Amino acid sequence: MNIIAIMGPHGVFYKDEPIKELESALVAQGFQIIWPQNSVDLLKFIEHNPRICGVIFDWDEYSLDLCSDINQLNEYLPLYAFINTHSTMDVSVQDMRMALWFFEYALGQAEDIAIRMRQYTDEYLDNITPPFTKALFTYVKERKYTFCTPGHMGGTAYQKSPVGCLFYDFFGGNTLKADVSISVTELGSLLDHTGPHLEAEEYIARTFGAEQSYIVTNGTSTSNKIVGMYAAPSGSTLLIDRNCHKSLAHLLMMNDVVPVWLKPTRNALGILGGIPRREFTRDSIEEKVAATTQAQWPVHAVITNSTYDGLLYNTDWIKQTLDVPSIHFDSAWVPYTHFHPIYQGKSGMSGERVAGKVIFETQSTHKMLAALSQASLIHIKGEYDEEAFNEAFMMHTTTSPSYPIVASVETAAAMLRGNPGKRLINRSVERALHFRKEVQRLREESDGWFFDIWQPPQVDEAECWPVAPGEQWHGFNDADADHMFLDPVKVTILTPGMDEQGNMSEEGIPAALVAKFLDERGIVVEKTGPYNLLFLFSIGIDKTKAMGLLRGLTEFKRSYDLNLRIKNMLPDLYAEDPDFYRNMRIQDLAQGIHKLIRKHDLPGLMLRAFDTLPEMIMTPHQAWQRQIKGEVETIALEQLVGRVSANMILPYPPGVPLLMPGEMLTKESRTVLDFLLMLCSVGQHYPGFETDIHGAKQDEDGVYRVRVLK
Amino acid sequence: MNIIAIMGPHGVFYKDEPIKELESALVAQGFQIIWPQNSVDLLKFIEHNPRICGVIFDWDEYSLDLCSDINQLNEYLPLYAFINTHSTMDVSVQDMRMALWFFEYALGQAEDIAIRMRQYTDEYLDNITPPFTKALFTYVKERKYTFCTPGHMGGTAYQKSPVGCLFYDFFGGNTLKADVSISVTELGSLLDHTGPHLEAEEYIARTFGAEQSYIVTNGTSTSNKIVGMYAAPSGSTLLIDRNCHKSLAHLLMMNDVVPVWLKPTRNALGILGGIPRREFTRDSIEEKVAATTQAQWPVHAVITNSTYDGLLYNTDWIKQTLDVPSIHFDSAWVPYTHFHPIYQGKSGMSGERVAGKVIFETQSTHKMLAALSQASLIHIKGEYDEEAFNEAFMMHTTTSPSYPIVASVETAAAMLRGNPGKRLINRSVERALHFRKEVQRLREESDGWFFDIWQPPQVDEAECWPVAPGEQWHGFNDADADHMFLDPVKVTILTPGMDEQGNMSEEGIPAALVAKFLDERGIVVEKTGPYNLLFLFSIGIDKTKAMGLLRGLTEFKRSYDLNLRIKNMLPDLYAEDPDFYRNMRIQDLAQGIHKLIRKHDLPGLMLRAFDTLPEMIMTPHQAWQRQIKGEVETIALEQLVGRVSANMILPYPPGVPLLMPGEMLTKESRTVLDFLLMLCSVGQHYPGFETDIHGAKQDEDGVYRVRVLK
Amino acid sequence: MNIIAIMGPHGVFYKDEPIKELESALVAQGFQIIWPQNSVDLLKFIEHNPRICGVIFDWDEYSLDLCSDINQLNEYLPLYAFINTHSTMDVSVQDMRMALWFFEYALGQAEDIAIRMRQYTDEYLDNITPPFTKALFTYVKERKYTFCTPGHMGGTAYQKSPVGCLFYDFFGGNTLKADVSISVTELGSLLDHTGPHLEAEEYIARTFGAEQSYIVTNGTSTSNKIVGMYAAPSGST
């Protein structure tokens, strides 16, 4: 933050000489001086360069032309207005939010003006910077306690080592110095939620419209367990989305609770649909209580809002309808809902309290917004026993917290604050839609096959496009209306291979092939299925990355139609097994893999595998008690029927739990095993296209084993 | 790493010109050239500057004088030897470990020599750098995957914000870029312990003499819970040191186990002594089993080795004697025992396996060595069910691990490796002893009162000085010999106030006064009691810091004897309450606080408070079940007798648990309450000298409340 | 291959300053910067100078006027397009064979952009350079086997002689270093037609529409005799 813009040659020494003296006084204070051509050039310079921290201009020449325009971009931006004798104040000044200092063109005034600019820059920074970070930065820069640990003291210990010196130089001083302890008493304590730490938590809770917010330094994986353990006593019944993150599976292994699963829907693609409205009604739950051994009325419920694929719930409907005292929205996917009105009545925090209920959102701040890994928030809307909740929090938090992680969580909030924050999301929304329109346009214009997007036939509107029963694009049968909506930011592309029905085509290009092509160009794919790929249009995503991906996709088709040798098109793939890939051409590779899917009837097997549930012999907790005594053994996957599984089995595809600890596959549910076996069989043919099943142990000879109770 | 040392003017153009050409070729590659005066100056330059990465010298002039001396400091240091026509190879070369390249003095050879120096520097770096860090650094520097998250991508998202740009600039690029995900597939996975991660874990386990090592990214606070939960099934009995860290108290709240406490000793000062030998004998344990409701034979035992005050156990004695299948040494204080032979048979990992037992050390790598906060190790010696142990590990680890924390844990090992690692600890030991001798010397030489160190009357030896029954310095009665030893690095200083017996003097200077004086000079105190202060002589501690503390101590006495106004000597204290401290002088402050201790008979009350245990009505787990249903209320501290406490109460002093969750103070154990009340009473008089009781809630009016069962 | 052409003064600091910072970052990497007058001057500069390995230009100002014209001369030529906020992608991009990187005008982006230009220049070179020559050049530049012959090793033996030093200097290092043996095992063998040598022969045979091609190192004078002797038994007509 050291670029000052001056706007203009005037052609008079009485004005120019004082500016020359000011240039010299500013260089003495180590400012860089920049000269925008005109008003437009300045506005773009401000818009693109946050380091622009001051503007000098003749008052009469620019004030009536600049003040409103600059206010719109940066309310706080230093203006240094030089007045004429006859300058006056128009009524336009009275109600505008401007930050103006008035200066005269005079020799020997530069020393005082330069000090005022420095002092005013600090006042601007002090206003916009958050309180804890401002204190932290001041300590790191200024402070010198001695007779103190840490013993390394700003990473001093690292510099005494040959490799240590390389390590120190790589990470830098700030990273080393930021590693502090509670010996810095003026910053208070995280664990106590005292001093500046309390100020930080209130800052966060205000920005996100929460009653109270906790900063977690071990990710939402831990945030879920803090909420979960405080909320679910042993021997209680919980309602849990079968579509749950692994951390909730681990929660079950750690807590003595009885799960009753909310049951999602699914289509032919193998994409998960929302928990239908009937799942929340008293009639459905009352019967589930009767059907669960020892079950009582649920004390706590966990709902994933939105779904991974961007299906949002009417949260007003759930809060009003669901007859459970404790409702937890795992909102790790939707931390940005408070920033666009399109999400009204579609987020956990939206609206007011629910009398006699406590409502939670847990959010993974990292890679959902911008924050360091392990940074997570718990947002509470309702009442908790403060002392008891803090005991639960301290039970899972170390006594040696990382102060940078804490600061990064607070600074993540600083990013989303103010008008620049709102203007960021408005920009990302417009770019997300723009890209969707370009895909649909290129699909219409191109000759023969092209990529398509899984969405309404027309998205000429800016909204979370509702799933309508009168539309076939989504491929769900008799969808509930006014229920599930498509988040614009969660973009799913589809590759040729399956019909509109969910029927199989003769010609197909498995998405796995495109994924390998994309890696040659250093493009990450978040999630892939048989014929789909997921991309996340974050705030970091600019027009360059969108065009790079868009052009990269047209280049894939270009090279594909050439029918290049895999050796030439995918050299990194070829290198994996030169003999296997010696004479294979790109079109044969696509046809060969599609043929395996066709022969194995993968889509049909995947549908039938998830249609009937494994039987819950005992709870995951009860089964883990046997495992604690080391009463497990490994069996081949083929010999798992009639055995009690000890681990969760999580196959990719379709990346959702298939078997839980305590469940047993029987003759009734043999299709489950047939799907898993098919994944291991199909996956053995092509180097680089290996099976991927979390919970199964692949042996050197390519046989799989699972753990079961003796 | 860019400083090259050249050693010499020769007075011949045939040698000098080629060196001039080499200087120019090296500057072109951005090396800095340094010229040590002679052999001694070079050795000091190497010793003090790890960035010295090459030495040029005439072979005949120096080889017989340098080779052994340099080998001793740096086995790997580049030598660029310039040969004469008649140079020969003495037998001294044959068995020495040297890294030599031979060059001729010739024009137009510099391009190839310079490339060889670059290539050889990389080969030197490649040899000494650990495998994962070398790959990580190469990725961070070189790599460019696109169509990837994280969305911020090297902190790009931060730069779009005004405050975000300040935040980015403060932390720097490397800190931002190092925030990665598993999308970087070539680095494998932490959670899977695969690829370079397995290589890193084997590197660590080898350096620390463990069977297997796990890297934990939530500190030893979490490492204790991973080991604890895998090790102690519900309804089992554990032996636990009453002198346990808070994380073990939290473990009890989280695990349904029945504690039987090992019972430490204590002296008049209130310093904890070791668990006597009788505590480990079958006779003592057999009776404890009979005395504990529902207890069976202990399945797992936890011992704190060493004690905080540096008492080490004969671990060979414990491993051989203790009839428990699972023994866990919380060795958070002694991670360095593998590096000095003085610790033989005094560490958990020392020696071999114990048939039919599993032995663990958990170590807080940070501030016990040098590593980032939250970095912790679990070391295992024996057999675990690998798949089951990893489930327990994954249950408490996030799905979004911090890659820098992981790298810092590995790099912490890199610091301790090789000959420089051994030469570091040898240096810290010699400095620790040197300081102890200077304190004892100044005590002998000075007129009247001076500081003393709590240790043997003579430490003219380098050893963990054994506590002998024929010595009175330690103030423990009938100490077991060949049992407890004083770690040289753990230095406790004492201030005047109490006799050798543990009797009270008329004159005294409470240590709290000295602690405030030390803060005026930016010296941290790790731990303080009524008349003691603890300092940790880490590897970061140099001779400058030792002298600063030593001089700071003599300055305190100098100013103290002047009897300066507190307003002048302790201006920051005076500012806290100008009216209270207006006319008070330093000697009156010391006398006034000592008088409160004398009147309140603090030492006597503190001894009696810990003599009789609160009664365990129910386990901390059973009591927490009632708290989960919100069946707690707050009572004044004064009204706690006959109530079931809900929280642990941890008073400072003496910083050890006084009451546990589930325990009840009765008329039998009223002294416990009297001590706590005395702490609140004595603590109310002096601003800056407030009561400090974790577990008690101080109200605005200075009344305290605790939580109890209804 | 080190001449970069930049096309234009814009009259705005927000665009010009970032280009100044880029000029400095590029000079640090030892690039020469050249400034063609206009589109025609650029096209002639490209046409006449194969060492032109990159072009910087404002996207909106030139893309619709340049992309087809440049594609016609050099499919592979680096373009460094600087975008405006409102820049869009016309259908003309979809089927054209372009090699585009999109950059923003921003301070402190030059280090990464300059590295991308270096990395992209290598990717361009790697695409157009033949496989064996690319490996050979990399060996000659990078490699250092010891306990090896030839004994002269990069013509070292020549430099020990008065006339030898004149001979070495006349022919140069590359000519001397290129004199290798089969000790460089990663290049395979000519006689065996193995490894990169087989790759080279297939490259040739493809370009000349042959079933199989052999590389002869004693001219067609010998090529005629190889074919002739294999083809004509004694006592035949």
Author numbering:
A (entry chain E), B (entry chain E): 1 to 710
C (entry chain E): 1 to 237
Please give the exact wording used by the authors of the publication that reports this structure.
for the polyamine production at neutral pH. decarboxylases have a similar enzymatic activity. between the inducible and the constitutive lysine decarboxylases. interacted with LdcI but was not capable of binding to LdcC. abolished by this procedure and no LdcIC-RavA complex could be detected. led to an assembly of the LdcCI-RavA complex.
